Amino acid sequence: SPGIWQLDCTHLEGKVILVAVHVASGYIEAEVIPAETGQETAYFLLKLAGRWPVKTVHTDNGSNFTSTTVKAACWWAGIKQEDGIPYNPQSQGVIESMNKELKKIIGQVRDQAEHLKTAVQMAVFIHNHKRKGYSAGERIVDIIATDIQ
């Protein structure tokens, strides 16, 4: 579980926000893209796996699961690509809740940024630093550090 991430795609202002959630910690990375393509998803995963030790990715839908470009990026980066079917039904609900929370934060910062991408990165910052006590940022580092030792 230190290496397990979940992909999540949500929509705002006619654009797409692609999110990777580290399941065990709640830590996220996100980007704005014009639309969800295999190529964009592939590039996003390459960035993620260069930054964190990504072992398994639960893909967000069947198109990205099937995508040859996504499969190539997962091969390149040593990621086991899996489906994202909630065998636990409380899982989708947690993502649903996270998308709602992220959009709430985006709303709270939206006027401080001209471009949506800036607001999204402010929201990532706030999300990862929020103490719940540890923050998601603290939890992911502790989880992975423990795993290394």
Which tokens belong to 117? 């991408």
Cβ 144 vs Cβ 51: under 8 Å = no
Which tokens belong to 144? 């992975």
Query: In the window 26-55, what residues touch its own copies (CB under 8 A)?
Result: 29, 43, 46-47, 49-53
- Interface with its own copies includes 70 (CB under 8 A)? no
| Partner touching 128 among ligand 1TD, its own copies, none, CB below 5 to 8 Å by kind | its own copies
In this chain, which stretch among 9-17, 58-66, 83-91, 121-129 interacts with its own copies, using CB under 8 A?
Answer: 121-129
Residue 86 vs 129, nearer CB to ligand 1TD: 129
Which tokens belong to 27? 């830590």
- Interface with ligand 1TD includes 54 (CB under 6 A)? no
Cα–Cα nearest to 19, from 106, 100, 89, 124: 124
- Interface with its own copies includes 124 (CB under 8 A)? yes
Q: Provide the sign of the torsion angle of the four alpha carbons 51, 14, 9, 75, taken in this order.
A: negative
Q: Residues before each break in the chain (C–N > 2.5 Å)?
A: 132
- Interface with ligand 1TD includes 66 (CB under 6 A)? no
Which tokens belong to 73? 């990026």
86 DSSP 8-state letter: -
Q: Which residues bind its own copies (CB under 8 A)?
A: 29, 43, 46-47, 49-53, 76-77, 112, 117-118, 121-122, 124-125, 128-129, 137-138, 141-142, 144-146, 148
Q: Which residues bind ligand 1TD (CB under 6 A)?
A: 39, 42-43, 46, 69, 72-73, 76, 113-115, 118
